[PDB]
């Protein structure tokens, strides 16, 4: 059946730490998906999956969006989607880390911070007006979104297949809604380092050692979400931790987003510099289907389905009609499919 597909979610979890086994068991009740979740070690919250039959599979990796800023009116940086076309054998192990959205600056259940959010308390604005930067009153900056990873365990070391970058966090004073062009890595020889962290937390990459509690962790360190700024805990009652999957935490600057290469953050505590998103990855073992594009507004996700192998028609591209179970192959350049259903006219 073409319609069959497996939808890996974040299992209902949120924040800097990923799901447990019970969360994923509850999330996949009365469905066709069943995963096992690592309980301890750096594989905590990573969902293993057994490929049911050898086939060509399309994998849809969607990263997670960043957190909104303190003045939570500018839109959050969206998470990146990567479509990959891979080939999979029987009993293969796919380790899937579904990214998680970075925590927002506002709203907050803390009363003082809530009064800051509604604009009645505006000490941060006075600090910006006086010192041209934030040093004392660390304002709410959004947490970085978590990357989505689909990889596998070949004889000792993980091998990445799909990485969807996570949306960077929005700074306190993000007056610009412009987003940078999306970054994709198609080569495995380029290292999967971590994002640079200044006051806020840079996003977590593929394989790098983290010495910072606020930066996001790389996948080979568990890839837990980074803590908030040290000044965000002292003389303040709020924290904006990045999501699971390398999401950096939010100081007055913006929290970096995870990826194959982690997103950056402001070296100083600039209240207006949003956190850069991560760099997505596509494996040479698979075929990239569509470019990397920012789509997601919340938690990341994974969609695995049987790829529609339709090289039988003249044009290399085709699709499945929702109305008719018959496959439809189209012709570009204003050409029209012939009556044979393969040829073009």
């Amino acid at each position: 059946d073409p319609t069959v597909h497996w939808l890996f979610t974040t299992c209902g979890a949120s924040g800097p730490h990923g799901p447990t086994q019970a969360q994923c068991n509850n999330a996949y009740q009365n469905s066709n998906l069943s995963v096992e979740v690592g309980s301890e070690g750096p594989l905590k919250g990573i969902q293993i999956w057994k490929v049911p039959a050898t086939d060509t599979y399309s994998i849809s990796g969607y990263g997670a969006a960043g957190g909104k800023g303190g003045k939570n009116t500018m839109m959050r940086s969206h998470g990146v989607s990567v479509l990959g076309i891979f080939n999979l054998e029987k009993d293969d192990m796919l380790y899937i880390l579904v990214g998680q959205q970075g925590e927002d600056a506002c709203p907050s259940t803390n009363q003082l911070i809530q009064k800051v959010c509604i604009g009645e308390n505006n000490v941060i604005e006075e600090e910006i007006r006086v010192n041209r930067s934030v040093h004392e009153w660390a304002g709410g900056g959004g947490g970085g979104g978590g990357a989505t990873y689909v990889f596998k365990m070949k004889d000792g070391v993980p091998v990445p297949l799909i990485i969807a970058a996570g949306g960077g966090g929005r700074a306190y004073g993000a007056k610009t809604d412009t987003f940078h062009p999306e970054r994709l890595e198609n080569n495995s020889s380029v290292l999967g380092l971590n994002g640079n962290s200044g006051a806020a937390g840079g996003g977590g990459g593929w394989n790098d050692n983290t010495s910072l509690l606020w930066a996001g962790k790389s996948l080979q360190e568990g890839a837990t979400g980074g803590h908030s700024c040290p000044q965000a805990m002292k003389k303040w009652g709020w924290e904006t931790r990045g999501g699971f999957g390398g999401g950096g935490g939010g100081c007055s600057s913006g929290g970096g987003g995870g990826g194959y290469i982690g997103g950056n953050a402001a070296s100083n505590n600039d209240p207006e510099m949003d956190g850069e998103d991560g760099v997505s990855f596509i494996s040479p073992l698979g075929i990239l289907y569509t470019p990397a594009l920012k789509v997601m507004e919340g938690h990341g996700e994974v969609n695995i389905k049987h790829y529609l192998n339709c090289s039988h028609c003249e044009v290399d591209e085709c699709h499945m009609d929702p109305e008719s179970h018959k496959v439809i192959c189209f012709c570009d350049h204003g050409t029209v499919l012939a009556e044979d259903g393969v040829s073009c006219i």
Partner: protein
């Protein structure tokens, strides 16, 4: 029936032939654009596609 709404969300964006191939891929074989409840996502995708220089 499901194209005027997407046109309203998206706006006047033009696509090159290779970009038209990628357009077909997102529009038909990505579930963001298939099921009605993710059209915003779909629209977002389309927008970002037009931002790439491969799309005129």
């Amino acid at each position: 029936m499901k194209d005027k709404f997407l046109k309203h969300l998206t706006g006047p964006l033009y696509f090159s032939p290779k970009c038209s191939k990628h357009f077909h891929r997102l529009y038909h074989n990505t579930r963001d654009c298939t099921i009605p409840a993710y059209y915003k996502r779909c629209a977002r995708l389309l927008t970002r596609l037009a931002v790439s220089p491969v799309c005129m």
